[PDB]
Design a protein around this ligand. Structure first.
Ligand code: MG
Ligand code: MG
Lengths: 414, 414
């Protein structure tokens, strides 16, 4: 009853629908996806602006000594005739009659009225931004579907847009279920108790996705309270519910029965390593009516994060309006021998480093293994930035064979 | 008087010193660098825990029918003898006398007291996490110098650390100087006015670096107010001052004279394209005494962001305690013909996409040019995630030659 991972997210990509757009402020638009076309209301520059510090001249007059008629520093709104020059700084408006601008280190100084000598001859239009040189009027400078970075903020500011129409981020509710879970603030542990590490992990994992987290806390293994928390969640306005634990084969695992009771489950077992259990349900809020997506993530720590990175991250990007929600996939060569599982494809976590020499004798990517891949050993996720997509061959891949990998974190490194 | 870029940041890397560590909360520790060693106070698991849902058995008894003595679900703290089995779920404590755990789909059901039939024979220690299986007691699970991601949050929660010793982020003050600058909220522009796009750009650029921004606003081209803003900045507790504009050859550019007056300037002209002007000064606060770093970024929009990505981002990472503050550098092949400047090396911005086939017939990176590289055309920074490091050869590199590139944004893409 296991669904392949390719079909698994094919279902999610078919059920998840992009969120309605919202108006936000300029800084609130950082990282979000543009939901409208931006047109510049005036050109840039809206006036002939000097590119270099120096003097606005007539190209015909050529080199020689000339008087400085007026001055036109960046700030103010007189013409120049053949035989006179005007002093300008960068950004300054060019007066009428000027054909070009000579630099200042291409001029000489030369106590009443001042005169300046021009050492070179300039072709017409030298060091001058014509009106609309960089941005023309009413032109599209940012288009729908673009992700707002720092430069796109600078373009919005150039055009005067401080209120932007964007697709918002999904609100995410997160909870843990386990009768053995205690808060991480707990000091000495009692018999059969462990601290709750999946919740704080998912909270931070969603925080990195710039989504609003709503911390529903620890829930015990009982149907009544687990239902109360679920009914609280969907009615609070959340878009995605993230459940950790209570989705296995035990007789107190009420996540699958409660999801299929309140909505429509699409799968509960996935051909994965790790993370054989993975429940994905569609729930409907009953108020403004809206559809809520629910991920019953497995309770094992490394299994929880892995399912988050492969099935929740694209779901978040798709609700936020990304055109390419899928993660970056790269081909790399192995740095050490590693065996694969024969039954299900193993998402082996590795540390990816770019090298100016590998894959053969060319520059490419390499990846060393993090160690043991136990579903409970969270030390395998430590400093892991890649996810090796290993086939279910059961063989041993040599320290040089090429495989496929998913980028789950920014490499940076050296 | 131009300093090469390699020597330029060699100075910055020599002047910038890592910040003193601060205690923060668990969620406040996301993204920051660990300034202490974390040791687990108890092992994980602190008790023998069942890996699979099923029954704890004696390996010697083998297959057959057996009674279910007690039940041990995840939660509670009776022994089992050869001939009896105990029902356990995942996470449950294993009673005394059990050697292994059989799965539940490897058992049969079989109305008074219940009996269960074991279909298979298990080797000793099957599906059982011994005490400390994943994390041993007093072991280092996170070490100094590590960047706290989502999984490192999960490890901190496992160990009970909710107050962490980390290196903080630098506080960054940002300001613009220009007598032609108006706020981006301005509607119809007057004669000689442009909206201030560098400030909002730098604010967002620093926001992406998870640093605290202090918006000092627009400052006119005059020495008195520009000094008042600088004296306000260093006295407010800031660690880095980011200035935009007023650092060129004009006669109202007071950033260089005021920086060298209040501190020690290390360079003012850099062999760069774009961004020939780039002033870096060291200022000292006069109170707890502290040293402030000042970047006089050039006023041209694309020139401002480029200097930010190459000289400010590593300075931020070094103050925050990174061991590899330098950006990721990758070798890629060109997708189109492009000419280089003969005098200074040009940092040409490109759109980098990973392809399963290029550089030859192998998988690698490719990069297409963004278009015109004018220092004032901010449309060249649009959707640019890479920075081509072009040599000062002045030749034309064919649509297939390999060059060096700096990753300034997460590729993602397809
Ligand atoms: Mg459980
Ligand atoms: Mg200026």
């Amino acid at each position: 009853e296991m669904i392949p991972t390719e079909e698994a997210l094919r279902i999610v990509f078919g059920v998840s629908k992009r969120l309605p757009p919202v108006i936000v402020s300029l800084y609130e638009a950082l990282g979000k996806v543009l939901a409208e076309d931006i047109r510049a209301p005036d050109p840039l520059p809206p006036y002939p602006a000097s590119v270099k510090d120096g003097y606005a001249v007539v190209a015909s007059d050529g080199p020689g000594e000339y008087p400085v008629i007026t001055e036109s520093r960046a700030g103010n709104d007189v013409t120049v005739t053949p035989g006179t020059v005007a002093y300008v700084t960068t950004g300054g408006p060019i007066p009428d009659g000027a054909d070009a601008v000579v630099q200042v280190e291409d001029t000489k100084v030369i106590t009443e009225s001042k005169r300046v000598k021009i050492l070179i001859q300039t072709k017409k239009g030298t060091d001058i931004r014509r009106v609309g040189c960089d941005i023309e009027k009413d032109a599209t400078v940012l288009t729908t579907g673009e992700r707002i970075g720092a430069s796109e903020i600078g373009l919005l500011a150039t055009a005067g847009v401080t209120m932007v129409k964007v697709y918002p981020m999904p609100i995410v509710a997160i909870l843990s279920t386990g009768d053995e879970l205690v808060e991480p603030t707990a000091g000495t542990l009692g018999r059969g108790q462990i601290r709750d590490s999946n919740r704080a992990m998912l909270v931070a994992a969603v925080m990195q996705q710039q989504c609003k987290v709503v911390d529903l806390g620890i829930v015990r293994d009982d149907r009544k309270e687990l239902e109360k928390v679920l009914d609280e969640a969907v009615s609070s306005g959340v878009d995605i519910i993230l459940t950790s634990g209570g989705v296995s084969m035990g007789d107190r695992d009420f996540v699958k029965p409660l999801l299929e009771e309140k909505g429509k489950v699409y799968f509960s077992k996935v051909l994965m390593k790790p993370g054989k259990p993975l429940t994905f349900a569609e729930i409907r809020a009953k108020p403004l009516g809206k559809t809520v997506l629910a991920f019953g993530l497995p309770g094992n720590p490394v299994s929880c994060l892995v399912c988050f990175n492969i099935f929740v991250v694209p779901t978040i990007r798709q609700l936020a309006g990304w055109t390419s929600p899928h993660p970056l996939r790269v081909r790399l060569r192995l740095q050490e021998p590693i065996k694969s599982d024969p039954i299900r494809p193993e998402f082996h976590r590795a540390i990816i480093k770019w090298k100016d020499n590998d894959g053969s004798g060319t520059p490419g990517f390499v990846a060393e293994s993090t160690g043991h891949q136990m579903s409970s050993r969270l030390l395998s996720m430590r400093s892991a930035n890649a996810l090796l997509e290993l086939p279910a061959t059961g063989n041993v891949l040599s320290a040089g064979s090429s495989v496929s990998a998913i980028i789950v974190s920014d490499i940076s490194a050296f």
